[PDB]
Structures are given as structure tokens and as C-alpha cells.
């Protein structure tokens, strides 16, 4: 997964790039969930990454987007 | 991904359980690589997890299995 959030890139824009790469692999729902819990958080920028980790397990993409909106 | 390595479970056995769950989603090669770099390492037991992180990026499943063999 080459996609990494730019330090000034809006979270939603990063999410779209991330999912564009995810779609190319026709990932199932379970795979999407795993990728959202791991790589989406791990590849987020310094500011957003801290916030996302502080959400705990089971946080939805929506809750992540709400947390890092801007 | 419910699969987590037991504190006394051989790494290879954990790998097989992990991949059994991965097969159920018909994950592509790219998805397998992402899962191997993230969840396989993150869900490994205390002993093996440290060793695996110390391998750095691009470490193959084979190198991981060699590192935590026993």
C-alpha cells in the first residue's frame, strides 16, 4: 500500500486514494475492515494518526473521518 | 482477524490458522502482502512480535518464519 496521507492533505482525500488502491484488489468486506483498522491508520499523517489510535478497536471509517475532518 | 498467536504456539501453526482465515476472503497477492506486513506481525505473541518488527519493511513470510521458528 503506497498511499500515505500528506502532512497537509485532508483525511477524506487520503481515504479516497487509499480506497482507490483497495478497489483494484476487489477486497471483500472483511479485508476492507482489516485494512481500515491497520494501514489506513498506520499510513495517516502525524496529526491524524494520534487521534485515530485514540479511538480504540472497532472504530468505523465514518468515526475516523469525523475525528480527522478538516 | 480473530487469529492471534498463543504465547506458546509455534509461529508456523499460527501462520496456518492466519492464512486459513485469509483464504476465506480469497485475498489477492497484494492483500496477502499487506496482511503479512501488518496483522500477521501485530497479532504475533510478545516474543515473536519484537523479532518480526526488527526485520524492517519488505521482510518475506519465509524470513518471518525463519526468524520465529521453534
Task: Choose, out of B32, B38, B53, B57, the residue to mutate when testing the contact with A (most A CBs < 10 Å).
Answer: B38
Residue B37's domain comprises: 2-70
Rg of chain B taking only CA atoms, in angstroms: 11
CA–CA dist B44, B65 (Å, integer): 11
Q: Report CA dihedral (A9, A13, A15, A18) to the nearest 10 degrees.
A: -90
CA–CA dist B28, A1 (Å, integer): 13
The count of domains in chain A is 1
Q: Do A39 and B42 touch (CB under 8 A)?
A: no
CA–CA dist A61, A33 (Å, integer): 9
SS3 of B3-60: the string is CCCCCCCCHHHHHHHHHHHHHCCCCCHHHHHHHHHCHHHHCCCHHHHHHHHCCCCCCC
CATH number, domain at A35?
1.10.1200.30
Is the Cβ–Cβ distance between B56 and B17 less than 8 Å?
no
Q: Do B34 and A30 touch (CB under 8 A)?
A: no
- The crossing angle, in degrees rounded to 10, of helices A29-37 and B29-37 is 30
B25 — contact with chain A (CB < 8 Å)?
yes
Q: What method was applied to determine this entry?
A: X-ray
Resolution (A): 1.7
CA–CA dist B20, B55 (Å, integer): 24
Amino acid at each position: 500500500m503506497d498511499i500515505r496521507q500528506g502532512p497537509k492533505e485532508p483525511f477524506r482525500d487520503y481515504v479516497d486514494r487509499f480506497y482507490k488502491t483497495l478497489r483494484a484488489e476487489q477486497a471483500s468486506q472483511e479485508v476492507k475492515n482489516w485494512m481500515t483498522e491497520t494501514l489506513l491508520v498506520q499510513n495517516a499523517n502525524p496529526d491524524c494518526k494520534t487521534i485515530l489510535k485514540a479511538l480504540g478497536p472497532g472504530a468505523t471509517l465514518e468515526e475516523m473521518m469525523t475525528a480527522c475532518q478538516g
